[PDB]
Amino acid sequence: CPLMVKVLDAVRGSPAINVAVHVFRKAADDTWEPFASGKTSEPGELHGLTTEEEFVEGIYKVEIDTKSYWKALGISPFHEHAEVVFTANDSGPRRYTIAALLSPYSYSTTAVVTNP
Amino acid sequence: CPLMVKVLDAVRGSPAINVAVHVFRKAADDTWEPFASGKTSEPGELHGLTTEEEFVEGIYKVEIDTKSYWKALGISPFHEHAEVVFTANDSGPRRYTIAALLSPYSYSTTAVVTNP
Amino acid sequence: CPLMVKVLDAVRGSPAINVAVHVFRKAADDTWEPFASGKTSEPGELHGLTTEEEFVEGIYKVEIDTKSYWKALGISPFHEHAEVVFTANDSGPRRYTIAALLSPYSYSTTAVVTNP
Amino acid sequence: CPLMVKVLDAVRGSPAINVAVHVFRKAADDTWEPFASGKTSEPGELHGLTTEEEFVEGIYKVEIDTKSYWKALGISPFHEHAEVVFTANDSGPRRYTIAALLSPYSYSTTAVVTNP
DSSP states (O other): OOEEEEEEETTTTEEOOSOEEEEEEEOTTSOEEEEEEEEOOTTSEEOOSOOTTTOOSEEEEEEEOHHHHHHHTTOOOSEEEEEEEEEESBTBOOEEEEEEEEETTEEEEEEEEEOO | OOEEEEEEETTTTEEOTTOEEEEEEEOTTSOEEEEEEEEOOTTSEEOOSOOTTTOOSEEEEEEEOHHHHHHHHTOOOSEEEEEEEEEEOOSSSOEEEEEEEEETTEEEEEEEEEOO | OOEEEEEEETTTTEEOOSOEEEEEEEOTTSOEEEEEEEEOOTTSEEOOSOOTTTOOSEEEEEEEOHHHHHHHTTOOOSEEEEEEEEEESBTBOOEEEEEEEEETTEEEEEEEEEOO | OOEEEEEEETTTTEEOTTOEEEEEEEOTTSOEEEEEEEEOOTTSEEOOSOOTTTOOSEEEEEEEOHHHHHHHHTOOOSEEEEEEEEEEOOSSSOEEEEEEEEETTEEEEEEEEEOO
16 A cells, blocks of 8 residues: 555544545646545554555645534544655655544644554 | 744654744635745744634644654654644634644644633 | 564664663652663564563653763764653553664654553 | 642643642762652743752652542543653753653653753
C-alpha cells in the first residue's frame, strides 16, 4: 500500500474512527484534482486509497476532515480540516504513512516514508 | 492585532526566523483571496497582519512556507508547506495566535484564542 | 501484548530503531522498581515487555533513551530522555501503546489505550 | 530569568492556568533535590523560578502536574504528570523556555533556547 492514513484522538487516547479523508493531486493546470478518498476504520487507519501504478509522481494533498469528526463527538473545534501537502515519488516509489494526532484546538501530522 | 503567527523550530530549539507566511480569506465565490502576508521576525513571530476592522468572520487559511525554511538549513523536508484552515467567530472579543512547531517530517499547529 | 512502545523520528520521517526503553513500577516504599526493558526494532516498536499476568495495577514509568539515540546520529539533543508516567490497569486490564515522536529539541508522546 | 515554563491547553486552545510546576536539580549524590516551583499564571507562564546565579550547569527535571489540571476540568487524563529532563550547558549566554502543549492522552514539550 503506497499510501496509508492513520488518525488518533488525543482527548480519548484512541484511534479516530470514521474520519473522512480526501486526497487530491495537482494537475497540469495547477488545480487540485480528486485522486482518492475514504474513511478511517476501527484502528484509525485508511488503507487501499491507491496502487503503486496509479500513485505517480506529483504534488498531493491529504485532507483530513477533523471538524466533522469533533462535531459528531459534541466538540466545536478550531480547524476546518487538516491539510497535508507533499511531493510524492519524485525519487522513485516510496511507501507513505500520513499520521495525524487530533485535539480540538491543535493537531500534529507526521509522515513516515519507507523504501519498499 | 487580532491575528498573530508564531513559528518554532523543533530541530534547533529556536524561533523559526524568516519564515514566509501567507494568509487567505475565502471570498463569497468560494475561492481563496490573498488577505495578509509577511516573514517571521527573530522571535519567530509575525505581528501586524491585520486589524480588528478587517478581520471579520469568515474562513481563513494560514500557509507557512516550511519547505523553503528547511531547504535554507540544508535539511530535507517532507511537506510543501503547513496549512492552517479555520473559521473566525465573533463570540465576544477575541485574539487568535496560530502557533506552529516544525520538524522536517512533522509539524504541530495550535490555536491559542484569548479575550484581552 | 498489554504494553507496546512505538518511537518515530521526526527529522528523518522513519521509525526510530535501536532506541533503549526502560520500564519501572512504583513499589510499596515509593521507589521506582525495574519492571522491564528492551530496544525498538526496525519498525520502531518494542513488543514483549510484559504479560497480562505480570502487568498488574500500579504506577508505571516508561523511560525512552532519546539522548543516546540522537547522539548516535550526530545530534546533541536537549532532553536526557522522555519519561512517560501513568497509572495502569486500575479499572481492569487494558492494552497500552506508548508512542513517542522525537525531534532534537522537542518530543510528543501519546497513549493509545484499548479494551481487549 | 534564565528559565521560564509555558503551558498550553490543546483542548480549549488557551493558556493552561494554575498548573503546578516543580523543578528539581540532580545533586552530587545522584538524587533529585527540589530547586524551584510555582503555579502558572493567566498567560500560562511561570516566571521567576530562578536566577542566573543559581541556575548553574547540571541536570534538571521540570514536573508539570497535568493530571490535576485535567481533573479540575473534568476530563479523564492518562498521565500522572509531564516530566522534562535536561542538562543545562553553559555555551555562551542562554535563556531556556520549557514549553508544554497538553491534551488528556498526549503532550508535547519543546525547549526554546535563545541568547538575549
